[PDB]
Design a protein around this ligand. Structure first.
Ligand SMILES: NC(=O)c1ccc[n+]([C@@H]2O[C@H](COP(=O)([O-])OP(=O)([O-])OC[C@H]3O[C@@H](n4cnc5c(N)[nH+]cnc54)[C@H](O)[C@@H]3O)[C@@H](O)[C@H]2O)c1
Ligand SMILES: NC(=O)c1ccc[n+]([C@@H]2O[C@H](COP(=O)([O-])OP(=O)([O-])OC[C@H]3O[C@@H](n4cnc5c(N)[nH+]cnc54)[C@H](O)[C@@H]3O)[C@@H](O)[C@H]2O)c1
Ligand SMILES: [Zn+2]
Ligand SMILES: [Zn+2]
Ligand SMILES: [Zn+2]
Ligand SMILES: [Zn+2]
Lengths: 374, 374
């Protein structure tokens, strides 16, 4: 009975940077042509959502953030062919339009319809489906999952297995897939190699999972929070190092430990300095370094291009390099077949209403992923 | 007979930066164990040699520069097994020791025995074979080809076809192989792709040759000297553009020309700004940019890592990525089998005694390669 009607529901609205979310009533318009309205079931708290709050990642405010989630289709707009009401779905923060030059390219995944490069905070048609206190509210990355209901473009949703546990598979919408793909797809980590992973949060742990799945012999985790080391070892780190323990810069330490540099390094934090350190610590002639972390808005790094001239490869990726709509259902199917584990990433569970406590847990260093249930 | 004896011969000594070469008598010691003394036949003038003069590339002075050459073995030290007196050879400015982790890696070529990273200007044993006016003179990259005779370590020399024309194949010692390999091996240019080549000197032309050999559909040459365009088109450029002709930055122009960014870009100049421009003009999700130019000593570039996070790959290489001792003989064989051309790169042929005139032709923009003949 809600099809074609405005839904009034609770969402977590971010009115201002550096402030708590406000859990309050919003109006969610019905889906227009090629749009899908989703009843959310679970959403994860990713550091990128916190970047919205801190101004690290600039997107228009006020906003409904959230991008790592799973839910059930409530209704579909005219012309939608890929999902139906009642289907389990994961919103895709990187769309897959299937039509642009990137979508057509065998390697590419950063579809040109994305709202990450130059965020507008709208639907594809340049408008918003959200009203709060009578005011229009921005979308985030075409997903906006911190709401009991959201509306997404069809190119920003994937149908997943009907028997999927949504409180787990939501992590396939961002943190797991990003880290795992960064290792297996972007870096193409090789059997017997030595990897260095900077940052041992949910995404970095997923990188470790991918490096172990790819057969790396050594996986060195690097974090300034030694509380992160036990879980990193559980999921495959062979050793962990805290830069604060050393007199020398950590790129030197890692070069020494790896007898001349690592095969693959990953920056999974979001700092300009660690991006350069991670490049430097890979072997100068054949090493590969992948940037995963999101840097502070509009800031440039400084580096010596001799690091590249000797033979290093430097790359980055969004969402692990995965073409989103093709890949998410397959990743869920693989999860259901026990090909990888998600539980190691889930440290806390809270109701959606305790979203602010969830962010407190992330900011204190205590959590990896908190999953919020609607 | 000269074997076992000091040779007094003519060489071009660089006594200090930013001065002409001094053409005068030097003494060349006989080769020690695992060393090879070569009578030079032809040597090219590479921009990297000019970088030694200009202080762009730092290496100990005084020095016998020159690294792109071909000659004939005069004698061998004890224990040499890979060349014999009378063999045609190309000195290898990047060695191939065959033993280090890089030499053993399938994709590495920047052998750890190189003298490029931390130049000492000596033989592998830390001593010099050259004296001039009673003073020791440094080697350059283990080669020192601006001399009628040089001494090189065995790991820094390759035997080539006895029927080779040395006045042409000397280019395989640096500029040809560097450009060609940067395209075919390091970038792995694909059939039907669009490439952008910044800098249309000898190395850039060789990058164009490689892009064409790989089947690129479009090859855009970029240079501030429009006199370089005719030859660039002869060897495969489909379009040429001069940044000075445009009101907008050339990365914007190139992005527009390529309907959203090129597949492969190459920096073949040695400027920090063009390194960043070249990265920026490749497609943000799947583009690849290769740094070939040598930048000014100790200077860092500034760049926004979002350029990489979207999906770009940035890499550099020495000597086109080629494992030097394995590759040089095969390249010469390929040249003899007419698989590529070298004549388009050679604009001037001068006696060795005219080295300074050869450098003046480079600096003025008038030459591609001058070959000096002994
Ligand atoms: N490329 C993508 O598509 C993508 C997707 C998901 C997340 N991200 C980004 O990836 C990064 C990690 O996300 P996350 O795992 O959720 O975050 P997180 O849980 O905050 O983990 C980051 C880790 O970095 C550690 N850390 C902080 N400073 C340093 C330092 N100087 N040296 C070493 N370790 C340090 C910190 O202790 C923490 O455990 C963030 O910047 C995200 O915005 C990118
Ligand atoms: N990586 C290696 O192993 C390797 C080997 C050989 C050469 N190099 C370097 O490659 C570079 C090219 O060498 P080369 O071809 O002998 O030099 P070159 O013949 O001087 O060619 C450089 C070209 O760049 C052009 N140029 C200068 N400034 C600009 C600009 N702003 N925008 C566009 N074009 C510009 C210039 O007009 C010239 O045609 C030099 O830096 C060499 O030191 C590197
Ligand atoms: Zn697309
Ligand atoms: Zn995320
Ligand atoms: Zn070696
Ligand atoms: Zn050179």
């Amino acid at each position: 009975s809600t099809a074609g009607k405005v839904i009034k529901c609770k969402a977590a609205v971010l009115w201002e940077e550096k402030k708590p979310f406000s859990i309050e009533e919003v109006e969610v318009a019905p889906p227009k042509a090629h749009e899908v309205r989703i009843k959310m079931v679970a959403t994860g708290i990713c550091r990128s959502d916190d970047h919205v709050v801190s101004g690290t990642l600039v997107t228009p405010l006020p906003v409904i953030a959230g991008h790592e989630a799973a839910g059930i289709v409530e209704s579909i707009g005219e012309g939608v062919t890929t999902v139906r009401p009642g289907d389990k779905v994961i919103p895709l923060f990187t769309p897959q339009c299937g039509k642009c030059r990137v979508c057509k390219h065998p390697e590419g995944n950063f579809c040109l319809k994305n709202d990450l490069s130059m965020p507008r905070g709208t639907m594809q048609d340049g408008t918003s489906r959200f009203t709060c206190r009578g005011k229009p509210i921005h979308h985030f990355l075409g997903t906006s999952t911190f709401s009991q209901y959201t509306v997404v473009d069809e190119i920003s949703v994937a149908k997943i297995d009907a028997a999927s546990p949504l409180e787990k598979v939501c992590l396939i919408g961002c943190g797991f897939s990003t880290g795992y793909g960064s290792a297996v797809k972007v870096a193409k980590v090789t059997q017997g190699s030595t990897c260095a992973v900077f940052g041992l949060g949910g995404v970095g742990l997923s990188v470790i999972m991918g490096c172990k799945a790819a057969g790396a012999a050594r996986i060195i985790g690097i974090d300034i929070n030694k509380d992160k080391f036990a879980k990193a070892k559980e999921v495959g780190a062979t050793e962990c190092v805290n830069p604060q323990d050393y007199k020398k810069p950590i790129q030197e330490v890692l070069t020494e430990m790896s007898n001349g540099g690592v095969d693959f390094s990953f920056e999974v934090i979001g700092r300009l300095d660690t991006m350069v350190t991670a490049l430097s610590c890979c072997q100068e002639a054949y090493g590969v370094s992948v940037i995963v972390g999101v840097p502070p808005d509009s800031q440039n790094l400084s580096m010596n291009p001799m690091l590249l001239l000797s033979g290093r490869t430097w790359k980055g990726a969004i969402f692990g390099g995965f073409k989103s709509k093709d890949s998410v259902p397959k990743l869920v199917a693989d999860f259901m077949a026990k090909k990888f584990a998600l539980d190691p990433l889930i440290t806390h569970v809270l109701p959606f209403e305790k979203i602010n406590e969830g962010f407190d847990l992330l900011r204190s260093g205590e959590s990896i992923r908190t999953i919020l249930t609607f």
